[PDB]
Amino acid sequence: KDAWEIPRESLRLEVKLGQGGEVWMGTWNGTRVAIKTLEAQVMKKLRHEKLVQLYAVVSEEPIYIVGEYMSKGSLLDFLKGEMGKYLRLPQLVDMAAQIASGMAYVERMNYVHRDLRAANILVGENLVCKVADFPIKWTAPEAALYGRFTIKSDVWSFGILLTELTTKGRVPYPGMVNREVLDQVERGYRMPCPPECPESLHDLMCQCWRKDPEERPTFEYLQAFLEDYFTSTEPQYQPGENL
Ligand SMILES: CC(C)(C)n1nc(Cc2cccc3ccccc23)c2c(N)ncnc21
């Protein structure tokens, strides 16, 4: 036991959110939190404002891990919902930048987030997106074939995450099954520019999807590129029908 340990008595459950374990909403010290029932020692070293904050942990069966409650659930559910109809490119590039901001912290800390996708991004209020929950379509070849998981395989997945955003939560490589993707991507296939998406944003995706992992961008580059986007790259942006 360490200083992250708390009394299970100090937590009140209220609303169940999901299952799979089970995730609960509730109150701590009479503050609102989320409880994930039955580890995440990785969340102890990591403390960034675009990462879902770990609050506590009950270290005996049944295990309760307590973190900050993100009020809109996954980014995927948030895009497939009533909001994705209104979301345009500035709102999505904003979201992509917060995610890249979190993964650039991960990059500095020399960590790897093996499963990076919109199901694992959590949304709160005012388009706050945070990285959490530390997939052949989202996975880079070197990782899916030879196990070479690097921050550069996460750059690849982030580039796929950029397709999820620009498509309002569509599944990448549409119409293609897993083995069809593996064999296609190996042969050099990359997804084309999504509808109403600037080629400048798709050019960025194609950088994240380079053959050689070392020639891919950093999130430090990615988050800088995305924050400066509507000034340095597309200051000529007019809102289309969907983007
Ligand atoms: C979508 C749904 C599965 C219901 N979900 N999942 C989470 C993750 C999560 C939950 C509880 C504690 C955590 C502690 C550290 C890191 C993440 C934690 C989560 C959350 N914070 N807030 C709201 N919903 C959440």
Side-chain angles (χ1 to χ4, degrees), residues 17-18 23-24 34-36 43 52-55 65-71 73-74 77 122 132-133:
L17 302 178
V23 179
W24 277 85
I35 300 96
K36 184 171 159 68
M43 315 206 52
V52 182
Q53 185 72 33
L54 175 65
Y55 288 173
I65 150 180
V66 179
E68 56 172 327
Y69 175 74
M70 307 298 298
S71 62
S74 85
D77 299 336
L122 289 155
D133 292 330

